[PDB]
């Protein structure tokens, strides 16, 4: 379940708005010494799609992808792959990924950094879904 | 000096068009065009209403000598812009009375096989729509048959009965008497009864 947890928090960081993550990390005032293994680099992720949504693969263009990697003093490696071109955001995501692998930070960050971010994204999504569902065409109602 | 057109051009033109559409889609049915109260004499009310509804700069109008009057021409030009042509073959709308000759009738454009709509519409002013030789009309627009008796010229009756021009070619006939009119499209089978 460790891999699933790492995937989940990396996902949450990858989907976070850079501004909110930066604000939340500044507020938590985490003191951690790290060195950048791989400087935040912006390149492309080639998008594979499927014929008919389910069939043979074909290349549906590319998207911008920024990747970063850091190492902590104890050797823990943090990584980040986020769509877009925000190098600072990628560095922050990699730092949080490294920290979340340390027993001293996993619980605290999960309660105060990751869960809050996921909840905010879910709230925004729910609001947008309500607005969109206003446009649903009603035809029949069961009596 | 010029004559007066519809008091309410939009609404009156729409009403007159709907009456004329009823007439053309149901041949032999008499309709009344009441929106215009005085025609541009010698043009009757129905003829003037049809011209005001349909005629414009895109539709040349030919008026036969008995119906060609300076005031009428000036009023037509002012109220519709419709170009006035002196030759029947150049007309989209042809206006005439009982004195229409066979030569003038045969000069009218009938359209072509590929462009049957490119012909002329003949507005003929008849003395009466009720006291002529009885005609039995069949075809599109008529459920079983319809009996009319307009007072028609011999040439017009020959054109209607014999149909020399092969369908889809042919002229569409609008008979006008005072404020009333009836329509016989090229499709109507006409038998002298």
């Amino acid at each position: 379940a460790d891999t699933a947890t790492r995937q989940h928090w990396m996902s949450v960081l990858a989907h976070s708005q850079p501004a909110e993550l930066a604000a939340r990390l500044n507020a938590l005032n985490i003191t951690a010494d790290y060195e950048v293994i791989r400087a935040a680099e912006t390149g492309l992720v080639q998008i594979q799609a499927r014929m008919g949504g389910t069939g043979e693969r074909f290349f549906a263009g590319d998207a911008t992808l920024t990747r970063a990697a850091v190492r902590l003093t104890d050797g823990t490696l943090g990584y980040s792959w986020v769509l877009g071109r925000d190098k600072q955001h990628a560095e922050r995501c990699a730092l949080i990924d490294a920290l979340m692998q340390q027993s001293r930070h996993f619980q605290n960050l999960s309660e105060t950094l990751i869960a809050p971010l996921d909840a905010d994204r879910m709230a925004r999504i729910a609001a947008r879904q309500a607005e969109v569902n206003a446009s649903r065409v009603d035809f029949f109602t069961m009596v | 000096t010029l004559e007066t057109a519809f008091m309410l051009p939009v609404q009156d033109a729409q009403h007159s068009f709907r009456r004329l559409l009823k007439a053309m889609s149901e041949p032999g049915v008499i309709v009344a065009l009441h929106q215009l109260k005085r025609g541009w004499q010698p043009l009757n009310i129905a003829t003037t209403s049809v011209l005001l509804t349909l005629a414009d700069n895109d539709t040349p109008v030919w008026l036969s000598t008995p119906l060609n009057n300076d005031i009428v021409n000036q009023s037509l030009r002012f109220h519709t812009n419709a170009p006035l042509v002196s030759q029947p073959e150049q007309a989209t709308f042809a206006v005439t009375d009982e004195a229409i000759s066979s030569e003038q009738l045969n000069a009218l454009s009938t359209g072509t096989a590929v462009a049957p709509e490119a012909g002329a519409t003949l507005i003929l002013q008849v003395a009466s729509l009720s006291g002529g030789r009885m005609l039995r009309l069949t075809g599109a627009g008529i459920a079983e048959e319809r009996m009319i008796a307009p007072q028609l010229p011999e040439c017009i009756l020959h054109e209607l009965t014999e149909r020399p021009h092969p369908f889809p070619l042919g002229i569409d006939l609008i008979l006008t008497c005072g404020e009333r009119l009836l329509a016989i499209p090229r499709t109507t089978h006409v038998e002298v009864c």
């Binding site: - | 939009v10 729409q14 096989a113 049957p116 709509e117 627009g141 569409d172």
Partner: protein, 278 residues
């Protein structure tokens, strides 16, 4: 009333008059595609511009307008067109077929029989019934002029030889007044019989393709078929799930991902009448 800043029915008088002359010519030449100088509407080409222009050129203040799409008044495009006409004319509107003086439709003829003085205006994408056999107007025009309709008969016979049935299921070609092969618009074959000897005047507008044609009241309209493969209309094993009718064109509503579906009348006014009768 008209209180939107536009001319009544949104068309200038010149356009109305041109369209009216086209309508009269179409009536005099049943089934023949009359070209007309149609204009761009607030609706995109292919969303009913020809029907809109016809209705604008015929409609008056005392008309009761019914607009339907797929047989339903509440369809998105039907609502759009009807709201547009309410804005630019102010005419009374109805969902009841028997109270309508003008019926503008897309792909249905109402189950309720039409009556004298009613006009039904069809929205037509492809006014040329030979288009899918012969894509070029330069050829189909001549074929209509010379009554050279063999490619259509060959298409039908080849369809029978290949599949055992005529492949066309909607916009089924029809011979009008014994002469003109006409496209009845994308109505399903179910509706084609209603066109034969109908007391109402039928108008057909193809705005994008710039054609108007007409079937006058009480005109013969016969679907092309064979004696041993006679014209047959759509049938369903189920009645309407709402009103129980077995005589109406049905639309298939997919209810769940597990394959559960129901069938309900496409003609919503007819469905309401049937439901109120019972």
């Amino acid at each position: 009333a008209n209180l939107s800043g536009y001319n009544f029915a949104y068309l200038d008088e010149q356009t109305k008059r041109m369209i009216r002359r086209a309508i009269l010519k179409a009536v005099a030449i049943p089934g023949y595609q009359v070209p007309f100088g149609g204009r761009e509407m607030p609706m995109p080409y292919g969303w009913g511009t020809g029907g809109i222009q016809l209705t604008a050129s015929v409609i008056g203040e005392s008309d009761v307008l019914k607009v339907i799409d797929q047989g339903a008044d509440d369809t998105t495009n039907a609502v759009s067109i009807r709201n547009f006409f309410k804005r630019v004319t102010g005419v009374n509107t109805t969902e009841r077929t028997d109270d309508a003086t003008l019926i503008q439709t897309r792909h249905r003829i109402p189950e309720t029989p039409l009556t004298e003085d009613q006009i039904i205006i069809f929205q037509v994408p492809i006014p040329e019934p030979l288009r899918f056999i012969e894509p070029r107007e330069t050829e189909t025009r001549t074929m209509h002029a010379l009554e050279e309709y063999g490619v259509m008969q060959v298409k039908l016979y080849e369809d029978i030889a290949r599949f055992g049935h005529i492949a066309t299921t909607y916009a089924y070609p029809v011979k009008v007044n014994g002469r003109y092969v006409m496209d009845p618009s994308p109505i399903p074959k179910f509706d084609n019989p209603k066109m034969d000897m109908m007391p109402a005047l039928q108008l057909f507008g193809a705005g994008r393709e710039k054609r108007i044609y007409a079937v006058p009241p009480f005109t013969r309209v016969e679907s092309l078929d064979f004696d041993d493969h006679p014209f047959t209309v759509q049938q369903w094993d189920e009645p309407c799930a709402i009103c129980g009718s077995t005589h109406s064109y049905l639309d298939e509503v997919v209810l769940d991902d597990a394959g559960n579906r129901m069938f309900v009348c496409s003609d919503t006014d007819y469905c309401r009448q049937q439901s109120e009768a019972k």
